[PDB]
Amino acid sequence: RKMAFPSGKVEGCMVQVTCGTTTLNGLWLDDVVYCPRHVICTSEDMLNPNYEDLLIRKSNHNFLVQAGNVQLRVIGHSMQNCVLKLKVDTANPKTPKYKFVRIQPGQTFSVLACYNGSPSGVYQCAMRPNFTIKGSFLNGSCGSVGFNIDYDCVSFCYMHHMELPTGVHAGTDLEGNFYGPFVDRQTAQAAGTDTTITVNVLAWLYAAVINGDRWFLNRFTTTLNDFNLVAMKYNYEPLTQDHVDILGPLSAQTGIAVLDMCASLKELLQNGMNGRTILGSALLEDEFTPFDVV
Amino acid sequence: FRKMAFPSGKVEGCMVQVTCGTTTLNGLWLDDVVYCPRHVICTSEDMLNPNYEDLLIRKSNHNFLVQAGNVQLRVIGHSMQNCVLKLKVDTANPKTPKYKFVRIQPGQTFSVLACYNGSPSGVYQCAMRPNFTIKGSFLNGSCGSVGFNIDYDCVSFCYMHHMELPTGVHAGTDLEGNFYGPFVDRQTAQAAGTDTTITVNVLAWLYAAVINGDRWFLNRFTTTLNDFNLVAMKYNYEPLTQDHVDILGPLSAQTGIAVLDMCASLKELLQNGMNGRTILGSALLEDEFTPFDVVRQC
């Protein structure tokens, strides 16, 4: 099962930020509230927003920040790339141990979906190769964040900014830099053709062998180049020597060489499932990383 | 269209570790009581045919070790309610949420906070199968993990994990210690019955697809509850009742597709497949969203 991290450490950091007629979510860590800078935009502004001109015209008291039933007083503001940083006069007593990390496509994380500062649900997802998220982002879920938790340290990696026409979602790291080519502007931007995360599928197949499913193995091997030539015909990401190195431990644990598992994958793409399941799925799952499987 | 778990923070603050002898599992600490599976008092030898009433008479408070993080809680009383052990402790949990104990029906969904030795590891959304099992991951060492729904600020606890069945699925009780399904907390041979598909949930998920603009499977036809149920039985689908049709009423009003019209859609899919098309980017029919879940998410 795709499990999300327990969300309590992040729930205690979610707040509501209102600027004018727009309200979205913010992340309250120590004495700073982080939120998407488009909170300062009207719908008209979003076609061609000049964020520097829009922000110079704001005073601290233009930002209403609510943490539950308590109003937080904003005492300073600044913009870092596409994120607004509101300095408040109270450090969040519930701030967990945290860091900010920028992730790469294929990496997984949990999203705490929030509405007007109130947590609604938690889900596990992956950064797609086209730099989008296939999420469940209710209309007012901008500012919801993605995170991993490792030994009680929350690593924040994603903040939600935009919905794309195909229904998928785009956003930034917590330093405000977008993932992919997207911008916080209402333009014609569109998610590029998405691809399957090949190294995640192979990590998952190793998990299946570890869990005692072997029916999809075969007696063939492949070269790396021949595998890539075939897999790209199915819209699979190319497998790199780094990816082969990353699977090394799981190869040693199951005694199945990586290119032998690649041969199995090639045949699975050619044949399908024939009614069988792999770890309870009728689909090749690509949202478990090799770190996740271990 | 993603499955979403409930935010787990209110429950994380209630998880503790319970140790009796060599056995450790998870317990739920609400006010001054810790709830956990009664089989924590059982040795591997006693598991073949335990007499829990006798085994607990022979235990004292000093036999139980309860740890809330870095804090040992002192047990000051013990009792059983059905298959759940209740340990009265010297301290009330200051993080106790508003909560209720509820019993759910097959086909209903809930979130599980998987825990290892009192330490929450992950959260996932699942459904109670018609055969009264859960397809989850537990863990190993996940006994005593709980399932729940949240409504406003009230946590409704509905499940506690007790055992893994040979097919890898999971069996447990409500928080009053009543098992879901024909299972016992003894080391004997038991198996999940043949499972079926939760028909009312598949229909909810089809309404969700139409709400999301996936409409290719809609057709001009309608069926009868009777005629559909014979197609369902032939495909290992739970029969559909008038209460089911009534529960789907809100979705049929919002979308304009009557339930027996959607049932004709479903019957056609069950006989002819998707013909290379997908529904909500998927090629199998999902049955772990309830009608309530779809309304809440749409």
PDB file of all heavy atoms in Angstrom, chain B residues 35-72, unseen atoms left out:
ATOM      1  N   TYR B  35      -6.245   1.136  25.534  1.00  0.00           N
ATOM      2  CA  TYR B  35      -6.940   0.037  24.879  1.00  0.00           C
ATOM      3  C   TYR B  35      -5.971  -0.702  23.961  1.00  0.00           C
ATOM      4  O   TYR B  35      -5.220  -0.068  23.208  1.00  0.00           O
ATOM      5  CB  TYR B  35      -8.129   0.561  24.071  1.00  0.00           C
ATOM      6  CG  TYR B  35      -9.096   1.404  24.862  1.00  0.00           C
ATOM      7  CD1 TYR B  35      -8.813   2.732  25.156  1.00  0.00           C
ATOM      8  CD2 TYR B  35     -10.311   0.877  25.307  1.00  0.00           C
ATOM      9  CE1 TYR B  35      -9.711   3.506  25.888  1.00  0.00           C
ATOM     10  CE2 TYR B  35     -11.207   1.653  26.030  1.00  0.00           C
ATOM     11  CZ  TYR B  35     -10.898   2.959  26.319  1.00  0.00           C
ATOM     12  OH  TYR B  35     -11.782   3.734  27.050  1.00  0.00           O
ATOM     13  N   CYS B  36      -5.974  -2.031  24.016  1.00  0.00           N
ATOM     14  CA  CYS B  36      -5.101  -2.802  23.136  1.00  0.00           C
ATOM     15  C   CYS B  36      -5.674  -4.211  22.985  1.00  0.00           C
ATOM     16  O   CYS B  36      -6.624  -4.585  23.685  1.00  0.00           O
ATOM     17  CB  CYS B  36      -3.657  -2.826  23.668  1.00  0.00           C
ATOM     18  SG  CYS B  36      -3.431  -3.908  25.100  1.00  0.00           S
ATOM     19  N   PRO B  37      -5.157  -5.006  22.038  1.00  0.00           N
ATOM     20  CA  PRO B  37      -5.699  -6.363  21.852  1.00  0.00           C
ATOM     21  C   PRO B  37      -5.425  -7.251  23.060  1.00  0.00           C
ATOM     22  O   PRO B  37      -4.327  -7.245  23.617  1.00  0.00           O
ATOM     23  CB  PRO B  37      -4.958  -6.871  20.609  1.00  0.00           C
ATOM     24  CG  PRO B  37      -4.543  -5.596  19.875  1.00  0.00           C
ATOM     25  CD  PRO B  37      -4.176  -4.665  20.988  1.00  0.00           C
ATOM     26  N   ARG B  38      -6.441  -8.007  23.482  1.00  0.00           N
ATOM     27  CA  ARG B  38      -6.248  -8.806  24.691  1.00  0.00           C
ATOM     28  C   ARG B  38      -5.188  -9.880  24.498  1.00  0.00           C
ATOM     29  O   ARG B  38      -4.620 -10.355  25.486  1.00  0.00           O
ATOM     30  CB  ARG B  38      -7.560  -9.444  25.153  1.00  0.00           C
ATOM     31  CG  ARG B  38      -8.114 -10.494  24.219  1.00  0.00           C
ATOM     32  CD  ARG B  38      -9.375 -11.131  24.804  1.00  0.00           C
ATOM     33  NE  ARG B  38      -9.900 -12.137  23.885  1.00  0.00           N
ATOM     34  CZ  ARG B  38     -10.925 -12.941  24.152  1.00  0.00           C
ATOM     35  NH1 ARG B  38     -11.555 -12.854  25.312  1.00  0.00           N
ATOM     36  NH2 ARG B  38     -11.318 -13.830  23.243  1.00  0.00           N
ATOM     37  N   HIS B  39      -4.868 -10.243  23.257  1.00  0.00           N
ATOM     38  CA  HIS B  39      -3.882 -11.308  23.098  1.00  0.00           C
ATOM     39  C   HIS B  39      -2.475 -10.876  23.490  1.00  0.00           C
ATOM     40  O   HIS B  39      -1.552 -11.695  23.421  1.00  0.00           O
ATOM     41  CB  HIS B  39      -3.923 -11.883  21.670  1.00  0.00           C
ATOM     42  CG  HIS B  39      -3.402 -10.982  20.587  1.00  0.00           C
ATOM     43  ND1 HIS B  39      -2.095 -10.546  20.529  1.00  0.00           N
ATOM     44  CD2 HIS B  39      -4.001 -10.506  19.467  1.00  0.00           C
ATOM     45  CE1 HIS B  39      -1.922  -9.810  19.446  1.00  0.00           C
ATOM     46  NE2 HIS B  39      -3.061  -9.778  18.779  1.00  0.00           N
ATOM     47  N   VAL B  40      -2.299  -9.634  23.946  1.00  0.00           N
ATOM     48  CA  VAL B  40      -1.008  -9.205  24.479  1.00  0.00           C
ATOM     49  C   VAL B  40      -0.636  -9.996  25.729  1.00  0.00           C
ATOM     50  O   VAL B  40       0.547 -10.101  26.071  1.00  0.00           O
ATOM     51  CB  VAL B  40      -1.018  -7.691  24.777  1.00  0.00           C
ATOM     52  CG1 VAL B  40      -1.909  -7.374  25.972  1.00  0.00           C
ATOM     53  CG2 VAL B  40       0.405  -7.194  25.011  1.00  0.00           C
ATOM     54  N   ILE B  41      -1.626 -10.537  26.448  1.00  0.00           N
ATOM     55  CA  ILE B  41      -1.316 -11.294  27.664  1.00  0.00           C
ATOM     56  C   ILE B  41      -0.954 -12.736  27.365  1.00  0.00           C
ATOM     57  O   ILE B  41      -0.635 -13.496  28.291  1.00  0.00           O
ATOM     58  CB  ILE B  41      -2.470 -11.269  28.687  1.00  0.00           C
ATOM     59  CG1 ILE B  41      -3.694 -12.024  28.164  1.00  0.00           C
ATOM     60  CG2 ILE B  41      -2.844  -9.825  29.045  1.00  0.00           C
ATOM     61  CD1 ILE B  41      -4.793 -12.193  29.220  1.00  0.00           C
ATOM     62  N   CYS B  42      -0.960 -13.129  26.099  1.00  0.00           N
ATOM     63  CA  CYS B  42      -0.827 -14.524  25.716  1.00  0.00           C
ATOM     64  C   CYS B  42       0.619 -14.851  25.388  1.00  0.00           C
ATOM     65  O   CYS B  42       1.285 -14.096  24.670  1.00  0.00           O
ATOM     66  CB  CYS B  42      -1.718 -14.831  24.517  1.00  0.00           C
ATOM     67  SG  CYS B  42      -3.378 -15.213  25.018  1.00  0.00           S
ATOM     68  N   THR B  43       1.098 -15.969  25.929  1.00  0.00           N
ATOM     69  CA  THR B  43       2.341 -16.561  25.473  1.00  0.00           C
ATOM     70  C   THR B  43       2.103 -17.279  24.150  1.00  0.00           C
ATOM     71  O   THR B  43       0.966 -17.577  23.777  1.00  0.00           O
ATOM     72  CB  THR B  43       2.882 -17.545  26.510  1.00  0.00           C
ATOM     73  OG1 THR B  43       1.876 -18.526  26.798  1.00  0.00           O
ATOM     74  CG2 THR B  43       3.238 -16.814  27.797  1.00  0.00           C
ATOM     75  N   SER B  44       3.196 -17.554  23.434  1.00  0.00           N
ATOM     76  CA  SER B  44       3.086 -18.356  22.218  1.00  0.00           C
ATOM     77  C   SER B  44       2.416 -19.694  22.500  1.00  0.00           C
ATOM     78  O   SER B  44       1.676 -20.218  21.659  1.00  0.00           O
ATOM     79  CB  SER B  44       4.467 -18.575  21.598  1.00  0.00           C
ATOM     80  OG  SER B  44       4.846 -17.465  20.802  1.00  0.00           O
ATOM     81  N   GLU B  45       2.654 -20.254  23.688  1.00  0.00           N
ATOM     82  CA  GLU B  45       2.050 -21.535  24.037  1.00  0.00           C
ATOM     83  C   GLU B  45       0.562 -21.387  24.333  1.00  0.00           C
ATOM     84  O   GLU B  45      -0.242 -22.243  23.944  1.00  0.00           O
ATOM     85  CB  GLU B  45       2.780 -22.145  25.234  1.00  0.00           C
ATOM     86  N   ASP B  46       0.176 -20.311  25.026  1.00  0.00           N
ATOM     87  CA  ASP B  46      -1.226 -20.108  25.376  1.00  0.00           C
ATOM     88  C   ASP B  46      -2.092 -19.812  24.157  1.00  0.00           C
ATOM     89  O   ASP B  46      -3.311 -19.990  24.226  1.00  0.00           O
ATOM     90  CB  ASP B  46      -1.352 -18.972  26.393  1.00  0.00           C
ATOM     91  N   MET B  47      -1.485 -19.394  23.043  1.00  0.00           N
ATOM     92  CA  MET B  47      -2.232 -18.977  21.860  1.00  0.00           C
ATOM     93  C   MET B  47      -3.001 -20.113  21.201  1.00  0.00           C
ATOM     94  O   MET B  47      -3.969 -19.846  20.479  1.00  0.00           O
ATOM     95  CB  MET B  47      -1.285 -18.370  20.831  1.00  0.00           C
ATOM     96  CG  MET B  47      -1.012 -16.909  21.039  1.00  0.00           C
ATOM     97  SD  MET B  47      -2.485 -15.892  21.299  1.00  0.00           S
ATOM     98  CE  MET B  47      -1.720 -14.324  20.916  1.00  0.00           C
ATOM     99  N   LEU B  48      -2.585 -21.366  21.406  1.00  0.00           N
ATOM    100  CA  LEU B  48      -3.256 -22.474  20.734  1.00  0.00           C
ATOM    101  C   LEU B  48      -4.679 -22.651  21.248  1.00  0.00           C
ATOM    102  O   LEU B  48      -5.589 -22.972  20.473  1.00  0.00           O
ATOM    103  CB  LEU B  48      -2.450 -23.762  20.910  1.00  0.00           C
ATOM    104  N   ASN B  49      -4.895 -22.445  22.544  1.00  0.00           N
ATOM    105  CA  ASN B  49      -6.245 -22.503  23.095  1.00  0.00           C
ATOM    106  C   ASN B  49      -6.343 -21.673  24.371  1.00  0.00           C
ATOM    107  O   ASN B  49      -6.449 -22.233  25.472  1.00  0.00           O
ATOM    108  CB  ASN B  49      -6.655 -23.950  23.368  1.00  0.00           C
ATOM    109  CG  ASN B  49      -8.106 -24.069  23.776  1.00  0.00           C
ATOM    110  OD1 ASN B  49      -8.417 -24.324  24.942  1.00  0.00           O
ATOM    111  ND2 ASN B  49      -9.006 -23.866  22.821  1.00  0.00           N
ATOM    112  N   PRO B  50      -6.351 -20.344  24.266  1.00  0.00           N
ATOM    113  CA  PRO B  50      -6.284 -19.504  25.467  1.00  0.00           C
ATOM    114  C   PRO B  50      -7.602 -19.426  26.215  1.00  0.00           C
ATOM    115  O   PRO B  50      -8.686 -19.448  25.630  1.00  0.00           O
ATOM    116  CB  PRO B  50      -5.896 -18.120  24.920  1.00  0.00           C
ATOM    117  CG  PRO B  50      -5.776 -18.263  23.410  1.00  0.00           C
ATOM    118  CD  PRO B  50      -6.444 -19.549  23.032  1.00  0.00           C
ATOM    119  N   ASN B  51      -7.484 -19.327  27.538  1.00  0.00           N
ATOM    120  CA  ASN B  51      -8.595 -19.047  28.443  1.00  0.00           C
ATOM    121  C   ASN B  51      -8.348 -17.644  28.993  1.00  0.00           C
ATOM    122  O   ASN B  51      -7.778 -17.469  30.074  1.00  0.00           O
ATOM    123  CB  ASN B  51      -8.682 -20.090  29.560  1.00  0.00           C
ATOM    124  CG  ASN B  51      -9.901 -19.903  30.442  1.00  0.00           C
ATOM    125  OD1 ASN B  51     -10.273 -18.781  30.794  1.00  0.00           O
ATOM    126  ND2 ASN B  51     -10.536 -21.007  30.801  1.00  0.00           N
ATOM    127  N   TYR B  52      -8.791 -16.637  28.240  1.00  0.00           N
ATOM    128  CA  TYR B  52      -8.417 -15.268  28.567  1.00  0.00           C
ATOM    129  C   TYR B  52      -8.881 -14.866  29.956  1.00  0.00           C
ATOM    130  O   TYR B  52      -8.179 -14.119  30.646  1.00  0.00           O
ATOM    131  CB  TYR B  52      -8.973 -14.318  27.511  1.00  0.00           C
ATOM    132  CG  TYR B  52      -8.202 -14.369  26.224  1.00  0.00           C
ATOM    133  CD1 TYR B  52      -8.681 -15.076  25.127  1.00  0.00           C
ATOM    134  CD2 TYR B  52      -6.986 -13.719  26.101  1.00  0.00           C
ATOM    135  CE1 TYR B  52      -7.983 -15.108  23.948  1.00  0.00           C
ATOM    136  CE2 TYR B  52      -6.283 -13.753  24.926  1.00  0.00           C
ATOM    137  CZ  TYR B  52      -6.780 -14.450  23.851  1.00  0.00           C
ATOM    138  OH  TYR B  52      -6.060 -14.485  22.669  1.00  0.00           O
ATOM    139  N   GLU B  53     -10.048 -15.350  30.391  1.00  0.00           N
ATOM    140  CA  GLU B  53     -10.513 -15.023  31.734  1.00  0.00           C
ATOM    141  C   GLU B  53      -9.542 -15.540  32.787  1.00  0.00           C
ATOM    142  O   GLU B  53      -9.203 -14.823  33.736  1.00  0.00           O
ATOM    143  CB  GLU B  53     -11.914 -15.592  31.962  1.00  0.00           C
ATOM    144  N   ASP B  54      -9.072 -16.780  32.624  1.00  0.00           N
ATOM    145  CA  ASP B  54      -8.101 -17.341  33.559  1.00  0.00           C
ATOM    146  C   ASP B  54      -6.759 -16.629  33.449  1.00  0.00           C
ATOM    147  O   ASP B  54      -6.158 -16.256  34.463  1.00  0.00           O
ATOM    148  CB  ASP B  54      -7.936 -18.843  33.310  1.00  0.00           C
ATOM    149  N   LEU B  55      -6.281 -16.419  32.218  1.00  0.00           N
ATOM    150  CA  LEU B  55      -4.979 -15.793  32.012  1.00  0.00           C
ATOM    151  C   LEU B  55      -4.913 -14.386  32.599  1.00  0.00           C
ATOM    152  O   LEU B  55      -3.844 -13.953  33.047  1.00  0.00           O
ATOM    153  CB  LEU B  55      -4.653 -15.748  30.522  1.00  0.00           C
ATOM    154  CG  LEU B  55      -4.287 -17.089  29.895  1.00  0.00           C
ATOM    155  CD1 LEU B  55      -3.917 -16.901  28.430  1.00  0.00           C
ATOM    156  CD2 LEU B  55      -3.129 -17.681  30.663  1.00  0.00           C
ATOM    157  N   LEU B  56      -6.024 -13.650  32.594  1.00  0.00           N
ATOM    158  CA  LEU B  56      -5.992 -12.285  33.109  1.00  0.00           C
ATOM    159  C   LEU B  56      -6.153 -12.232  34.623  1.00  0.00           C
ATOM    160  O   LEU B  56      -5.630 -11.306  35.260  1.00  0.00           O
ATOM    161  CB  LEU B  56      -7.075 -11.432  32.443  1.00  0.00           C
ATOM    162  CG  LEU B  56      -6.970  -9.920  32.707  1.00  0.00           C
ATOM    163  CD1 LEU B  56      -5.649  -9.363  32.197  1.00  0.00           C
ATOM    164  CD2 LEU B  56      -8.146  -9.155  32.093  1.00  0.00           C
ATOM    165  N   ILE B  57      -6.872 -13.198  35.209  1.00  0.00           N
ATOM    166  CA  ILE B  57      -6.924 -13.306  36.666  1.00  0.00           C
ATOM    167  C   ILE B  57      -5.515 -13.440  37.231  1.00  0.00           C
ATOM    168  O   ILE B  57      -5.177 -12.832  38.253  1.00  0.00           O
ATOM    169  CB  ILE B  57      -7.819 -14.488  37.086  1.00  0.00           C
ATOM    170  N   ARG B  58      -4.661 -14.205  36.553  1.00  0.00           N
ATOM    171  CA  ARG B  58      -3.304 -14.457  37.019  1.00  0.00           C
ATOM    172  C   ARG B  58      -2.359 -13.291  36.772  1.00  0.00           C
ATOM    173  O   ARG B  58      -1.230 -13.314  37.273  1.00  0.00           O
ATOM    174  CB  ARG B  58      -2.744 -15.712  36.350  1.00  0.00           C
ATOM    175  N   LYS B  59      -2.774 -12.290  36.005  1.00  0.00           N
ATOM    176  CA  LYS B  59      -1.955 -11.111  35.794  1.00  0.00           C
ATOM    177  C   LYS B  59      -2.267 -10.075  36.861  1.00  0.00           C
ATOM    178  O   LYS B  59      -3.364 -10.051  37.425  1.00  0.00           O
ATOM    179  CB  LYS B  59      -2.205 -10.523  34.403  1.00  0.00           C
ATOM    180  CG  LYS B  59      -1.824 -11.450  33.259  1.00  0.00           C
ATOM    181  CD  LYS B  59      -0.332 -11.410  33.005  1.00  0.00           C
ATOM    182  CE  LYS B  59       0.056 -12.297  31.849  1.00  0.00           C
ATOM    183  NZ  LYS B  59       1.513 -12.164  31.547  1.00  0.00           N
ATOM    184  N   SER B  60      -1.279  -9.228  37.144  1.00  0.00           N
ATOM    185  CA  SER B  60      -1.419  -8.055  37.992  1.00  0.00           C
ATOM    186  C   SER B  60      -0.990  -6.816  37.218  1.00  0.00           C
ATOM    187  O   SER B  60      -0.444  -6.898  36.115  1.00  0.00           O
ATOM    188  CB  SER B  60      -0.579  -8.174  39.273  1.00  0.00           C
ATOM    189  OG  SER B  60      -0.930  -9.330  40.011  1.00  0.00           O
ATOM    190  N   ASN B  61      -1.226  -5.655  37.829  1.00  0.00           N
ATOM    191  CA  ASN B  61      -0.833  -4.400  37.198  1.00  0.00           C
ATOM    192  C   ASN B  61       0.662  -4.369  36.900  1.00  0.00           C
ATOM    193  O   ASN B  61       1.080  -3.860  35.855  1.00  0.00           O
ATOM    194  CB  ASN B  61      -1.239  -3.231  38.085  1.00  0.00           C
ATOM    195  CG  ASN B  61      -2.733  -3.111  38.218  1.00  0.00           C
ATOM    196  OD1 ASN B  61      -3.481  -3.539  37.332  1.00  0.00           O
ATOM    197  ND2 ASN B  61      -3.187  -2.550  39.331  1.00  0.00           N
ATOM    198  N   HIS B  62       1.484  -4.949  37.781  1.00  0.00           N
ATOM    199  CA  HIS B  62       2.924  -4.934  37.536  1.00  0.00           C
ATOM    200  C   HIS B  62       3.335  -5.747  36.315  1.00  0.00           C
ATOM    201  O   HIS B  62       4.489  -5.642  35.885  1.00  0.00           O
ATOM    202  CB  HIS B  62       3.690  -5.434  38.772  1.00  0.00           C
ATOM    203  CG  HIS B  62       3.346  -6.832  39.184  1.00  0.00           C
ATOM    204  ND1 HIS B  62       3.661  -7.935  38.419  1.00  0.00           N
ATOM    205  CD2 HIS B  62       2.732  -7.308  40.294  1.00  0.00           C
ATOM    206  CE1 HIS B  62       3.230  -9.028  39.025  1.00  0.00           C
ATOM    207  NE2 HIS B  62       2.674  -8.677  40.170  1.00  0.00           N
ATOM    208  N   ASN B  63       2.440  -6.554  35.746  1.00  0.00           N
ATOM    209  CA  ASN B  63       2.778  -7.321  34.553  1.00  0.00           C
ATOM    210  C   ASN B  63       2.746  -6.482  33.280  1.00  0.00           C
ATOM    211  O   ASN B  63       3.219  -6.942  32.235  1.00  0.00           O
ATOM    212  CB  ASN B  63       1.820  -8.505  34.399  1.00  0.00           C
ATOM    213  CG  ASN B  63       2.121  -9.635  35.375  1.00  0.00           C
ATOM    214  OD1 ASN B  63       1.304  -9.970  36.235  1.00  0.00           O
ATOM    215  ND2 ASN B  63       3.300 -10.217  35.247  1.00  0.00           N
ATOM    216  N   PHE B  64       2.201  -5.274  33.333  1.00  0.00           N
ATOM    217  CA  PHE B  64       2.011  -4.462  32.140  1.00  0.00           C
ATOM    218  C   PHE B  64       2.983  -3.298  32.152  1.00  0.00           C
ATOM    219  O   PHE B  64       3.105  -2.596  33.160  1.00  0.00           O
ATOM    220  CB  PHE B  64       0.576  -3.953  32.058  1.00  0.00           C
ATOM    221  CG  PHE B  64      -0.431  -5.046  31.927  1.00  0.00           C
ATOM    222  CD1 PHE B  64      -1.180  -5.445  33.021  1.00  0.00           C
ATOM    223  CD2 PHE B  64      -0.625  -5.680  30.713  1.00  0.00           C
ATOM    224  CE1 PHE B  64      -2.107  -6.464  32.911  1.00  0.00           C
ATOM    225  CE2 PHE B  64      -1.551  -6.702  30.589  1.00  0.00           C
ATOM    226  CZ  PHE B  64      -2.291  -7.099  31.692  1.00  0.00           C
ATOM    227  N   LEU B  65       3.670  -3.100  31.034  1.00  0.00           N
ATOM    228  CA  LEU B  65       4.565  -1.968  30.851  1.00  0.00           C
ATOM    229  C   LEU B  65       4.018  -1.105  29.721  1.00  0.00           C
ATOM    230  O   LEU B  65       3.923  -1.565  28.579  1.00  0.00           O
ATOM    231  CB  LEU B  65       5.987  -2.446  30.540  1.00  0.00           C
ATOM    232  N   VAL B  66       3.652   0.135  30.041  1.00  0.00           N
ATOM    233  CA  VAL B  66       3.082   1.074  29.080  1.00  0.00           C
ATOM    234  C   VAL B  66       4.027   2.255  28.938  1.00  0.00           C
ATOM    235  O   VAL B  66       4.390   2.889  29.936  1.00  0.00           O
ATOM    236  CB  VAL B  66       1.687   1.555  29.511  1.00  0.00           C
ATOM    237  CG1 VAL B  66       1.161   2.573  28.512  1.00  0.00           C
ATOM    238  CG2 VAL B  66       0.740   0.375  29.635  1.00  0.00           C
ATOM    239  N   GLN B  67       4.415   2.555  27.702  1.00  0.00           N
ATOM    240  CA  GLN B  67       5.349   3.632  27.406  1.00  0.00           C
ATOM    241  C   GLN B  67       4.713   4.582  26.403  1.00  0.00           C
ATOM    242  O   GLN B  67       4.288   4.157  25.323  1.00  0.00           O
ATOM    243  CB  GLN B  67       6.665   3.085  26.854  1.00  0.00           C
ATOM    244  N   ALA B  68       4.634   5.852  26.772  1.00  0.00           N
ATOM    245  CA  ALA B  68       4.191   6.927  25.891  1.00  0.00           C
ATOM    246  C   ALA B  68       5.446   7.715  25.534  1.00  0.00           C
ATOM    247  O   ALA B  68       5.879   8.589  26.285  1.00  0.00           O
ATOM    248  CB  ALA B  68       3.139   7.806  26.559  1.00  0.00           C
ATOM    249  N   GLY B  69       6.041   7.383  24.390  1.00  0.00           N
ATOM    250  CA  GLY B  69       7.312   7.968  24.017  1.00  0.00           C
ATOM    251  C   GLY B  69       8.398   7.632  25.018  1.00  0.00           C
ATOM    252  O   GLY B  69       8.771   6.463  25.171  1.00  0.00           O
ATOM    253  N   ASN B  70       8.893   8.650  25.721  1.00  0.00           N
ATOM    254  CA  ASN B  70       9.942   8.498  26.720  1.00  0.00           C
ATOM    255  C   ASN B  70       9.389   8.449  28.140  1.00  0.00           C
ATOM    256  O   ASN B  70      10.145   8.644  29.099  1.00  0.00           O
ATOM    257  CB  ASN B  70      10.958   9.637  26.592  1.00  0.00           C
ATOM    258  N   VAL B  71       8.092   8.195  28.296  1.00  0.00           N
ATOM    259  CA  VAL B  71       7.418   8.262  29.590  1.00  0.00           C
ATOM    260  C   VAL B  71       6.718   6.934  29.838  1.00  0.00           C
ATOM    261  O   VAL B  71       5.868   6.519  29.040  1.00  0.00           O
ATOM    262  CB  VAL B  71       6.407   9.417  29.647  1.00  0.00           C
ATOM    263  CG1 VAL B  71       5.568   9.316  30.904  1.00  0.00           C
ATOM    264  CG2 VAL B  71       7.118  10.765  29.570  1.00  0.00           C
ATOM    265  N   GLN B  72       7.061   6.277  30.945  1.00  0.00           N
ATOM    266  CA  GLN B  72       6.324   5.097  31.367  1.00  0.00           C
ATOM    267  C   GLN B  72       5.054   5.528  32.085  1.00  0.00           C
ATOM    268  O   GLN B  72       5.089   6.410  32.948  1.00  0.00           O
ATOM    269  CB  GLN B  72       7.182   4.214  32.276  1.00  0.00           C
TER     270      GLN B  72
END
